[PDB]
Symmetry: D2
Subunit: 293 residues, 4 copies
């Protein structure tokens, strides 16, 4: 199994993508053993990015690595097709899309047509990003099999029965969980790994949970998983997508600038309070020899 | 109370806004007694429009009428602010925003800051568009009172107690329901009207229900309301946002082009089946002299 | 329209029904203008009562009035049939049942069979008690029509579109809301009234809201409804089913003993805090001459 | 880890517990390597049983084995206490309760008081049966820790993160999943076992999945788990609680009588459809030498 980072998009003080900070972060992740980068995902504020910005992200990250899954979806299918075709010139792992968001009660037929359209134009393998809470719909194992053209799926759902069903119905599909709290479990149970937001700021933790689980040291993997859980919980106090910026700077030592409002940056007091919540975990991770003092 | 149409955005065969068809539709709505037009709402595929397109819509409708509420929201707050400021040049009723959609677990503080930021830059009264199922969050009467700057609210929810609470906690606020099925009830219970997607295609019916209820002819209002409900139900069979185009052509006698994929147009057989479901209702409305033949 | 009280079951210190206290309460409600009493409902802790206790309740209340709807449902259909048959000797308004509770995902076929079975043995008109949050299932207007033997329905749901649909699909059916917060609206919009837990402790207020709305005095009805809403909210702080006992003693001046654990009685401090939350409302109600000192 | 069967309660034609069939079934399960029997759970229609019947089940099963966890909960706490106390004469594993069902919006304090009361009177270890969909409330890892007296938990929920959190916050608690579909995963990920309804009819399969997973033959375990999943899905088509009777007859060869209405037995057409869905699987299991005949 693999750990894949849904890489954060750093923004400047005037709300443009900070390409240089993005390259530094991508470089660090690969050097810490992250397998692939998922670009323009939720953690990277994909839905907040224009199609031009989604493409700018791909170009910046491609300067560092070809191990990229390029998320291209949105509510203008013409724009998503254009991004899919533009990716032809990039020797990457694949493209991906979440389901059309916002609109409630979209028919299965329309959801299927959206995805098959992307598959028909794609110059690369296509990955399903399934995220029912964010998009309002579920493209489950049965619907994925109907669509019939996915190389893999990232399933962001707490119900691992649903994630396992992709493998049951689609034995050749790569099946990843979008949970950070399921790294140990996913590795242990025969699935293909995790696309983990928290690997932006603790890539060494996420890779080590996976390694320990693979060695069948499940108790040691769970001890580490549970520490990582506490960091995820702390990130949720003030908003995880904002907090991820603060936590990357704290644990990794470089900054990723600003999020894009309405994902507002933490203020100084919130950042102080969050660091207070994770200080103790950092000390435990240093004692475990996962982080350097 | 008022009937407000969340106006359909007609798209051309090549997926651009058809300004001429939009003007023909807006004219017809105003002529048939609709109070105000809500532009770039769900029914108008607001979330599928770029900021430039949201402005193009405003410009087209504004050639017809000043009686506009201009929806401006989205996931790039700079773009929503720019649209709010640009509205200064238009003599319209107000601007509006739904809550930031897609991202789950957004903090109350960040939600409040989003709306307060728009209120601070707005040259017009600001209306809350509350739609929990579509956006994933609820800006309830309490949060609305804390935000403090709303002239009115459109509440799209399966819970009229929630809608009444805006009136209870904000006595001077205009409070509209986002449901076609609650026109009789809203008028009967002291609320301010309905922002009704079905008024795109049966403005005569929606205005008549409201009139009957204001005359205290509740049985007669209900009988008409219940007929309208059957049309609403028929529109949902193949997807209401797509079906609304077909129904407007059927009842109002002009074309509104296409929706924007992934809100796909109805195919020929779906259109045939939809018309079959409503043709008897059409005959009955013509026999009742609500529709002219 | 009518106000129907889902009458509280008073228990002794040793967890038996206090029949004499129940008779006091029932007499007061009727004398204060409540139209009918719904016995063994949620407010009466019906699911906590044995079949023998359900019958004891009917017998006690029948000593005071025959204006009774007798709730008989449960998870032993033989017991529910027995209670239904036993009611033949009581000249009451009807019997009622909620849907089988606890078990998730029971087929429509099985639900319809449960209700048709009760209808086939019933010596009285049968009323559907639909409460999806409590029972986990929804016997909607369509399923009610398929069952085809209900005289009326009490719909406990905040979605009034759902409640109106019973009238739309079953024009002869009596249709009541299970909400205290919808008395003004129900009365205004052509429905048949409310089965109102809060009418246990403020029957005067519920009857008055209904009267005001009937007289088309919608603003006065709403002002009173909104005051009643604050009492309902206060009751929810420590648990409504428990708080209803404290509130009845406070407003009506006799006690109703104890609830049945795990519906635990409020402690003295909780009772003191609840009283503090409602004493200002009591004062307004006195000044409006709705209550006497 | 363990496999625990929530044993089905067989009823006679006169709606009494069929003790002799119950005994034959319990003997078979123990003989086929089931670890423990969970008596009066959902699968045993516990909510449908009077306290007397709950005791009668315990006594019948105790004739066969002492490896029993005795579920005692319900909405009359005095009855639940009585059952807890009566268990003192039985040398069993533990007692259990689900949370008080039906009533929405019970306070955390009252739920905590319910469970602590049972712990105070229990002569045996106490197990939480957490089933939020059925009971309408969640007793999560934090509330379990607060209660502070559970020896174990059975978590029936679509959220393995939630189950893992009991281990994370209560490291010396036994933590079981209530899912048949997670036997391979539970064993792999360091959890304590599964209380699995499907083990009533395919105890051979459930025990073999667990063994393969323990041997770290995860792919072989998943292969067999995915066949078991197909049987579970089939059982849900017409209602699992009813289908469990038919499937026990079909796979183990003896019958378990009838369920208790409103859990109605499958009709002949439903039984035929159910068999058609599982006979291929039965053939597969015979070929794999998991089932003899």
């Amino acid at each position: 199994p693999e750990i894949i980072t849904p890489i954060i998009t750093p923004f400047t003080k005037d709300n443009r993508i900070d390409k240089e900070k993005l390259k530094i972060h991508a470089e660090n992740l690969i050097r810490k053993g992250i397998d692939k980068l998922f670009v323009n995902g939720t953690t990277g504020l994909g839905p907040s990015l224009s199609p031009e910005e989604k493409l700018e992200n791909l170009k910046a990250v491609y300067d560092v690595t070809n191990k990229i899954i390029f998320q291209v979806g949105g509510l203008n299918l013409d724009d998503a097709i254009r991004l899919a075709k533009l990716s032809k010139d990039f020797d990457i792992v694949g493209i991906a899309s979440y389901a059309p968001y916002y609109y409630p009660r979209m028919s299965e037929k329309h959801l299927v047509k959206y995805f098959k359209t992307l598959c028909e134009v794609s110059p690369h393998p296509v990955y399903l990003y399934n995220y029912p809470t964010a998009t309002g719909k579920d493209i489950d194992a049965k619907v994925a099999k109907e669509i019939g053209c996915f190389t893999g799926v990232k399933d962001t759902i707490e119900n691992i029965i649903h994630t396992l069903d992709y493998k049951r119905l689609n034995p050749n599909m790569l099946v990843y969980s979008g949970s950070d709290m399921l790294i140990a479990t996913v590795a242990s149970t025969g699935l293909d790994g995790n696309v983990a937001a928290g690997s932006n700021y603790l890539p060494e933790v996420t890779v080590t949970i996976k390694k320990l689980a693979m060695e069948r040291k499940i108790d040691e993997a769970l001890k580490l998983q549970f520490l990582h859980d506490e960091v995820i919980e702390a990130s949720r106090i003030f908003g995880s997508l904002s907090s991820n910026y603060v936590l990357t700077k704290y644990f990794q030592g470089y900054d990723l600038g600003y999020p894009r409002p309405p994902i507002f940056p933490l203020d100084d007091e919130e950042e102080r309070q969050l660091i207070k919540k994770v200080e103790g975990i950092r000390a435990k991770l240093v004692e475990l020899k996962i982080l350097k003092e």
